[PDB]
Amino acid sequence: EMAVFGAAAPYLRKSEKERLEAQTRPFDLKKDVFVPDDKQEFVKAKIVSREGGKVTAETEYGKTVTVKEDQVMQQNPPKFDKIEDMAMLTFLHEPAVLYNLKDRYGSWMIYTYSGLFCVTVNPYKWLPVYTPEVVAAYRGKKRSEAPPHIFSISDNAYQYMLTDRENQSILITGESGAGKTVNTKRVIQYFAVLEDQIIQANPALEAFGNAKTVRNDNSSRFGKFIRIHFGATGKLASADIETYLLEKSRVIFQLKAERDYHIFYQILSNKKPELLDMLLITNNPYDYAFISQGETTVASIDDAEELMATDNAFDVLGFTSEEKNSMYKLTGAIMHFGNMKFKLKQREEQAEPDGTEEADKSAYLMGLNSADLLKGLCHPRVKVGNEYVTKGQNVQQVIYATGALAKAVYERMFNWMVTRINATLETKQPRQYFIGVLDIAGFEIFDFNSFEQLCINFTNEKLQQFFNHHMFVLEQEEYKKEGIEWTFIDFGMDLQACIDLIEKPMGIMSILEEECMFPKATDMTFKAKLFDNHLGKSANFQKPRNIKGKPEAHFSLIHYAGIVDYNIIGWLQKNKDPLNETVVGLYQKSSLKLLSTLTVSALHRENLNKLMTNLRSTHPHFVRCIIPNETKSPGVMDNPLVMHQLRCNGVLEGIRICRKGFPNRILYGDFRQRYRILNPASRKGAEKLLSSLDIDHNQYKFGHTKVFFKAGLLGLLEEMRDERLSRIITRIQAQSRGVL
Amino acid sequence: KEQQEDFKEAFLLFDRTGECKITLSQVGDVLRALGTNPTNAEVKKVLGNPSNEEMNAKKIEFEQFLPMMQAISNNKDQGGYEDFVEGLRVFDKEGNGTVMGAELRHVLATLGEKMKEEEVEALLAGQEDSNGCINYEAFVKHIMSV
Numbered sequence: 001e002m003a004v005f006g007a008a009a010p011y012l013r014k015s016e017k018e019r020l021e022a023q024t025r026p027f028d029l030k031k032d033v034f035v036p037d038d039k040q041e042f043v044k045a046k047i048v049s050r051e052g053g054k055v056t057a058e059t060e061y062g063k064t065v066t067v068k069e070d071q072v073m074q075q076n077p078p079k080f081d082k083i084e085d086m087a088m089l090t091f092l093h094e095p096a097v098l099y100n101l102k103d104r105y106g107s108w109m110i111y112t113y114s115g116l117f118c119v120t121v122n123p124y125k126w127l128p129v130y131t132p133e134v135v136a137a138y139r140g141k142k143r144s145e146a147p148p149h150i151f152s153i154s155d156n157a158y159q160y161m162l163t164d165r166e167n168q169s170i171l172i173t174g175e176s177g178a179g180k181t182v183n184t185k186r187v188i189q190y191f192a193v194l195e196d197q198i199i200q201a202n203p204a205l206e207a208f209g210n211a212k213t214v215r216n217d218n219s220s221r222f223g224k225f226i227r228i229h230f231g232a233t234g235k236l237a238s239a240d241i242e243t244y245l246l247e248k249s250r251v252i253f254q255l256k257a258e259r260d261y262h263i264f265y266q267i268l269s270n271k272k273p274e275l276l277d278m279l280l281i282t283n284n285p286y287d288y289a290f291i292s293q294g295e296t297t298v299a300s301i302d303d304a305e306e307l308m309a310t311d312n313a314f315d316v317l318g319f320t321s322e323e324k325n326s327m328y329k330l331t332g333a334i335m336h337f338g339n340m341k342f343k344l345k346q347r348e349e350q351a352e353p354d355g356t357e358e359a360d361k362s363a364y365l366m367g368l369n370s371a372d373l374l375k376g377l378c379h380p381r382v383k384v385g386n387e388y389v390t391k392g393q394n395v396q397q398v399i400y401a402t403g404a405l406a407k408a409v410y411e412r413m414f415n416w417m418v419t420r421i422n423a424t425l426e427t428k429q430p431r432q433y434f435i436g437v438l439d440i441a442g443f444e445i446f447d448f449n450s451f452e453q454l455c456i457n458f459t460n461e462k463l464q465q466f467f468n469h470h471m472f473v474l475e476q477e478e479y480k481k482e483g484i485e486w487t488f489i490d491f492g493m494d495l496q497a498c499i500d501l502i503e504k505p506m507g508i509m510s511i512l513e514e515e516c517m518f519p520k521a522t523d524m525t526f527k528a529k530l531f532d533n534h535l536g537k538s539a540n541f542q543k544p545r546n547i548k549g550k551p552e553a554h555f556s557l558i559h560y561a562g563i564v565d566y567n568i569i570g571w572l573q574k575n576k577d578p579l580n581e582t583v584v585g586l587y588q589k590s591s592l593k594l595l596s597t598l599t600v601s602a603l604h605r606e607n608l609n610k611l612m613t614n615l616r617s618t619h620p621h622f623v624r625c626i627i628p629n630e631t632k633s634p635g636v637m638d639n640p641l642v643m644h645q646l647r648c649n650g651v652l653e654g655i656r657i658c659r660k661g662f663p664n665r666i667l668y669g670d671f672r673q674r675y676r677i678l679n680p681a682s683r684k685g686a687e688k689l690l691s692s693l694d695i696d697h698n699q700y701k702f703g704h705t706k707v708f709f710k711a712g713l714l715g716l717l718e719e720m721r722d723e724r725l726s727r728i729i730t731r732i733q734a735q736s737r738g739v740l
Numbered sequence: 741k742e743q744q745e746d747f748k749e750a751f752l753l754f755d756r757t758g759e760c761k762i763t764l765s766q767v768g769d770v771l772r773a774l775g776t777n778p779t780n781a782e783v784k785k786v787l788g789n790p791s792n793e794e795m796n797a798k799k800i801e802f803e804q805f806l807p808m809m810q811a812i813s814n815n816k817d818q819g820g821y822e823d824f825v826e827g828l829r830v831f832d833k834e835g836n837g838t839v840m841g842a843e844l845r846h847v848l849a850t851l852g853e854k855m856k857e858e859e860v861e862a863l864l865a866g867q868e869d870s871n872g873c874i875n876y877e878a879f880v881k882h883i884m885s886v
């Protein structure tokens with residue numbers, strides 16, 4: 001019937017007549033294929049004629065170009081297109097997935113299944129699929145019968161928790177701007193049926209944890225993990241939130257075409273003059289080094305409105321106003337730090353300050369003493385053995401120390417804020433079997449990939465390895481249950497090479513950290529050592545490539561998506577993390593909230609390992625979000641961009657891994673009672689017919705409860721059944737004519 | 741020779757002109773009334789796959805018809821109970837031994853070769869239950885028994 005949903009029913013699933021008319025779409029598989037193009041580089045066409053090695057084809061847009069016959073792949077039959085789940089696609093191809101996704105999105109179809117994944121595209125308009133009636137309809141619906149939707153996987157996870165009594169986790173990862181936040185918001189209200197508090201707090205976290213990327217304006221750099229603590233009877237009890245992998249490099253440093261976090265620019269907006277007056281802010285972003293080096297401002301966001309939204313979120317919430325004032329004071333103090341000059345003492349390596357007025361403002365902001373802070377920074381004291389001794393610091397060391405201190409205090413601010421909202425939201429009801437909802441940034445591949453991109457790529461690589469391990473474990477468990485195993489090789493080592501190059505000793509990060517402590521280490525030396533220790537020795541590492549005039553590259557890696565080239569310049573300045581301790585004591589001796597407050601690669605590695613060890617305890621669930629186009633036009637979508645994101649998200653590799661074994665498993669009794677039409681003469685007959693099918697027995701495997709075989713055998717069986725039943729129908733027509 | 745005598749007696753009985761001549765449109769009907777169940781392909785290939793204009797234009801005598809039935813008698817492809825029941829069971833969604841009449845009508849009109857409504861309606865006349873369904877077992881008994 002499909003009519004329960006009503007208004008959203010056409011969007012959730014098409015009606016029978018459309019399927020019938022599309023099925024009879026007359027196309028000959030022998031003449032329609034996929035040909036590479038020039039600007040989309042993947043298009044569909046039909047061969048006008050075959051001329052040996054070179055074949056000429058006419059495309060839908062209209063062109064008379066010809067290509068070598070080796071570059072054209074088979075096209076999916078019209079009888080099988082617009083499939084709700086593409087896991088069992090008859091012909092798996094890289095552009096076939098793009099074609100199916102665009103054909104569905106043209107019929108305004110959003111959610112699509114890809115096996116264990118759930119691929120969703122981002123439109124730009126309100127939709128009726130989120131109607132509470134739809135939520136009720138999906139209540140208790142499995143993945144198979146119901147049309148694709150995030151609620152289906154949420155209910156599946158809920159049922160898994162109910163029946164197995166174990167934690168469940170749902171992971172979301174897509175290119176920045178794919179709408180992960182919105183999807184999390186929809187799923188959290190689905191669980192709700194406190195969420196109001198979650199949405200109320202969301203703007204603050206977004207503003208304090210986002211910045212404008214060259215591809216997106218509201219990228220969420222850090223990852224979020226929202227845990228819904230349930231009861232023993234599966235009733236909502238409370239909510240917690242955890243944040244991982246905050247990018248200190250963003251706060252300390254910005255790129256040429258990049259902005260800092262939204263908060264600094266928001267307070268730089270003058271529509272709240274009181275804050276500027278009490279922060280001694282000149283309203284000129286170029287007067288602060290930490291922000292000027294990036295992008296001054298953009299017209300996509302009005303800033304002031306975001307500031308008022310964040311202020312509303314803060315004010316009507318668990319915490320008071322003086323705490324907000326303290327937070328603003330400390331943020332302004334962080335802004336102030338980008339103005340000290342210092343100077344190396346003549347005839348000495350120690351450095352003394354010159355502009356002793358920004359220090360005064362900062363000390364007043366924290367309530368510290370300017371002289372004490374300056375003395376601590378210039379001459380830090382450390383306890384050796386049982387006695388305190390001063391240390392010498394040059395201009396570079398003190399600059400690195402102050403940058404590290406500023407970024408560390410910003411990170412601690414973020415963590416404390418997360419704790420505060422979590423405490424406000426938490427309530428004393430019993431907590432049991434929390435459900436985790438993680439969202440993280442995608443596998444971004446820009447034209448100027450750098451250290452931050454490297455860290456994000458490493459995190460994505462670890463996530464992909466976890467996904468592959470989960471698939472291997474599931475398949476091995478299924479094989480053990482069925483008593484027969486196939487391809488008993490784990491897929492982790494199919495991906496472990498990149499991880500080995502990244503994290504293990506003498507790896508890229510280890511080598512960089514080694515450079516950090518070397519007396520005189522420069523970027524040139526870093527590249528030389530990398531080449532010496534890895535060039536040729538490691539398969540993944542290879543020389544950089546210069547294509548269509550990229551700005552520059554230094555080396556490249558072979559990730560699960562493709563060859564990615566990085567850059568070196570600035571990495572040393574972006575990895576040093578000297579955390580002074582005397583100033584930490586000064587903060588701990590401060591009359592302010594700072595009392596409660598108290599290398600980058602190593603801390604990132606530790607945070608990532610904490611995340612993985614937390615995740616391993618939970619049963620995962622995977623979702624994929626992909627933007628249709630750069631422009632906000634909903635209907636149109638760029639084929640190269642979608643294909644690049646599909647490669648990045650690794651849907652194709654996952655489905656291929658699934659296909660490696662014997663995905664098609666059918667109950668012996670069901671097969672015997674259904675597909676016996678092919679060979680009309682429930683176990684002896686099943687095996688007899690299977691043996692008498694006159695097909696090579698290496699393709700299919702004989703089980704006891706479920707018969708297994710590869711998709712190639714399944715398609716051949718289905719088509720020969722179709723022709724056999726066509727012959728039977730023709731015989732019926734002949735008999736009816738005989739009746740005449 | 742007695743079988744040939746019966747063939748010619750039926751041919752002249754079906755001859756409305758007395759010249760032992762018939763049209764192509766009724767040759768299949770004669771062959772089927774004589775004990776055959778051929779498809780359009782079989783009745784067209786014996787005539788050489790003529791066109792529509794030649795289908796309704798030329799006439800064939802018993803002498804020229806003798807090779808057709810002689811060759812058709814060498815064909816033993818006529819179907820059986822098991823095949824027909826297996827084919828009709830797939831349409832039995834509820835699996836009680838009955839098939840939807842409307843679904844059967846639509847598939848006959850779209851799938852396979854379409855047939856004139858009156859003959860099939862007469863064939864199923866009384867073969868459908870009070871629910872509008874046809875017990876395909878009794879239908880199979882009826883169609884092939886005659």
Ligand SMILES: Nc1ncnc2c1ncn2[C@@H]1O[C@H](COP(=O)(O)OP(=O)(O)O)[C@@H](O)[C@H]1O
Pocket residue numbers: 122123124125126127175176177178179180181182183218219220
């Ligand atoms: N269900 C939806 N319907 C319409 N638009 C959506 C939906 N989900 C996301 N979007 C679009 O995505 C944008 C927000 O993306 P966002 O979640 O901030 O990306 P990120 O998670 O990378 O920050 C909005 O402009 C909105 O138009």
Ligand SMILES: [Mg+2]
Pocket residue numbers: 180181218219220
């Ligand atoms: Mg977001």
